[model samples]
Target: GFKQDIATLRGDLRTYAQDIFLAFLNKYPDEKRNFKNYVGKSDQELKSMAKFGDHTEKVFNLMMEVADRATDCVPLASDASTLVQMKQHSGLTTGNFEKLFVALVEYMRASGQSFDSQSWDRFGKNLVSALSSAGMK
Candidate 1:
């Protein structure tokens, strides 16, 4: 069930985040299409997605921040399980968002293991496969 839900969230996170990303077009209305590069809208981009409240954004940001710090959490195709618990971003009422958030920040500052892009890419592929348009394994 854990993996299943993780798949669900992973699929939609890309979806929701991309949808939010598209909304950026309105922000830079003056730019001509195709002439410029589109970097997804800035400013805690996670804030706009459904069920992704400020708390969730905080957690997610912390995850990315710590992942970068963790020797093995470079967000490569491998290392999906490096921060296993942090992957579950929603319905985290058990740990209370605050406690889990702190753990994530601390976890980011900690270190462990080697980084592997292939393994985590496989993990991400599996997680995203459950959803249509998630694309590529």
Candidate 2:
């Protein structure tokens, strides 16, 4: 069920990436400061920035990748490594990623994308496990 939902979700990535990013920033305004290009910009301005849109798509794609792996019960070793490197380089905490995951799920729900509770639970569990394995605190 989750796999099918993810397959459908993949097709809408380009359509929803920006809105999902906006929702994340709206929920955690402080996180916006983490992006140098996003600093001192209004939502409208950020939306117009090429760098902002590219980064948003990148993050959305990464989330989709993780969700894909989660559906298969695969260990997120490589993804964990990537996140660990990002944490080391950017100083982002596990909590930040956790919030972002929640923001994504919330956005999907609010936008009327259908996913069952079990699907989300499986994804959330795997994500938290991966983050922990990455040594995120």
Candidate 3:
């Protein structure tokens, strides 16, 4: 069901990824400066380079791994690898988690996909459930 949701949304991955990136930056404009070193480019340069576009595809795949409860799933984001442990070392507070959750939901809605209210909720619910599975309180 989760992968199916992605398949339905495939029509606008780039747009959704770009929108997600914009939303993320809107939330933390300073992050652009923070990430400049890691990305080897200015914020604007990264935005134009599909940085977030590629990032979102991995996010989608990571979501599928979470949705499927894959034991062998590898970490896509270094900070997010072993996400339960990440909570202690990284800036991954539950509040930030909610932001990303809402980001994905908002992008999904804008993707012109055929999801009902329950389907939308499932995706959100699954994110939380997956967090719990990773030992996140």
Candidate 4:
């Protein structure tokens, strides 16, 4: 079940959030442009910054939130209001969100974290729906 998978993921969050975030950046270098604070910094330097850890943890927390409510129709706009606002300012597209989810899944798989495809697919569906519901286009 997704809930069990998510619970497992929760344990990995603290240990692997930085690595998982770095994986996303590695996959989409262009996305790094969104982080003005990280400009001109090497990946090694970026990882050492408090801002880097803060943002990565925030993203992980949001993932947890999405997983927690994936099976329900609850509105998630409030929980993700900050992200919605940031997207509005940055002109981020829904496609980017999808890519981030893909990066997360791939990172977990590469790390040998077990998760069933059906559960992940359901989680992805809910994540996209939540993004749309939060007014992300």
Top-lDDT candidate index? 2
Instruction: Tell me how far the alpha carbon of residue 55 in candidate 3 is from the true structure, in angstroms, after superposition.
Output: 3.1
Tens digits of per-residue lDDT, candidate 2, 27-112, equal: 88988877766778777888887877787778778777877775364447777767777743367666777777688778767776
Candidate 3: residue 86 Cα off by (Å): 4.8
Winner by TM-score = 2
> Residue-wise lDDT of candidate 3 within 26-94, one digit each (tens)?
555654443443345544665576555677566655554554453223223332346657533255444
User: Model 4, range 47-133, lDDT digits (tens) per residue?
Assistant: 788878887787777777756864442336565455667643358776777777687778756776566645665566566667677
Quote model 4's TM-score: 0.76
* Ranking of all predicted structures according to TM-score, beginning with the best and ending with the worst: 2, 4, 3, 1
Rank list by lDDT? 2, 4, 3, 1
User: In model 4, which runs have C-alpha deviations exceeding 4 angstroms?
Assistant: 72-90
Lowest lDDT 10-mer window, candidate 3? 70-79
Query: Could you tell me which residue pairs clash in candidate 3?
Result: none
RMSD of each: 15.4, 2.4, 6.1, 3.0
Error of 2 at 48 (Å): 1.8
TM-score of each: 0.22, 0.81, 0.55, 0.76
